[PDB]
Amino acid sequence: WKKLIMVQHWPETVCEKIQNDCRDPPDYWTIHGLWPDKSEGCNRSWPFNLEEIKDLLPEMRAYWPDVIHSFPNRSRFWKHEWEKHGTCAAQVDALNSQKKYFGRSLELYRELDLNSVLLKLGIKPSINYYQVADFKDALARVYGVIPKIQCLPPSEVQTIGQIELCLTKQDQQLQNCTSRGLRVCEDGPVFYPPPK
Numbered sequence: 001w002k003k004l005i006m007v008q009h010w011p012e013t014v015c016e017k018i019q020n021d022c023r024d025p026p027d028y029w030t031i032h033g034l035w036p037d038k039s040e041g042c043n044r045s046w047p048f049n050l051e052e053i054k055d056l057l058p059e060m061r062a063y064w065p066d067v068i069h070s071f072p073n074r075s076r077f078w079k080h081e082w083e084k085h086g087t088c089a090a091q092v093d094a095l096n097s098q099k100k101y102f103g104r105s106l107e108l109y110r111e112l113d114l115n116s117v118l119l120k121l122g123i124k125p126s127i128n129y130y131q132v133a134d135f136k137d138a139l140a141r142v143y144g145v146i147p148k149i150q151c152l153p154p155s156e157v158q159t160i161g162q163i164e165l166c167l168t169k170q171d172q173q174l175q176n177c178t179s180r181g182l183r184v185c186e187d188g189p190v191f192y193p194p195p196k
């Protein structure tokens, strides 16, 4: 793999069942994961061990909740993220343990502060549609790199669900990059839904 992708998602869009973390979806973008771009599932002999990240659990519950399957055991999601992505990300010294990977992921989420960025730009959940360019152009100005922005299609207009920012392999600095239904958002109107 060559780069990392910091993936954040909008709970009201991605939530699938009104349970657990999705019963009242958080009203802020949360962490989906920190993913090596081209490799997954790198070490079946290195299982997730919740005990190793015990210190991070309050932050993981707040910022890395399970808002896709919303299983009652929140650690099923983090296990999935570790096994699929973290074992590969551990080739990088800064990410070379469970604690370091998850801790760095949380740090990057704090440093990027996508939630404050959007709000400062005036991009808030609304009944009124935005244009996809509102998100893309404003995030490109703030982060200096082009995000990938992914949507659920109409099941009306597409709904924004996920924002991806690429990061360098060694130091996880912002760089340019160049699913459960999320696809690239089409140019045009997009709904950014206020949580239920």
Ligand SMILES: *[C@@H]1O[C@H](CO)[C@@H](O)[C@H](O)[C@H]1NC(C)=O
Residues within 6 Å of the ligand: 042, 043, 045, 046
């Ligand atoms: C798999 O992880 C174990 C536990 O960290 C480590 O000892 C081993 O070297 C890893 N194997 C590969 C191919 O990375």
Ligand SMILES: *[C@@H]1O[C@H](CO)[C@@H](O)[C@H](O)[C@H]1NC(C)=O
Residues within 6 Å of the ligand: 144, 145, 146, 174, 175, 176
């Ligand atoms: C990423 O690409 C954009 C769009 O072409 C460019 O303006 C920007 O300077 C690039 N950022 C980095 C960090 O390379």
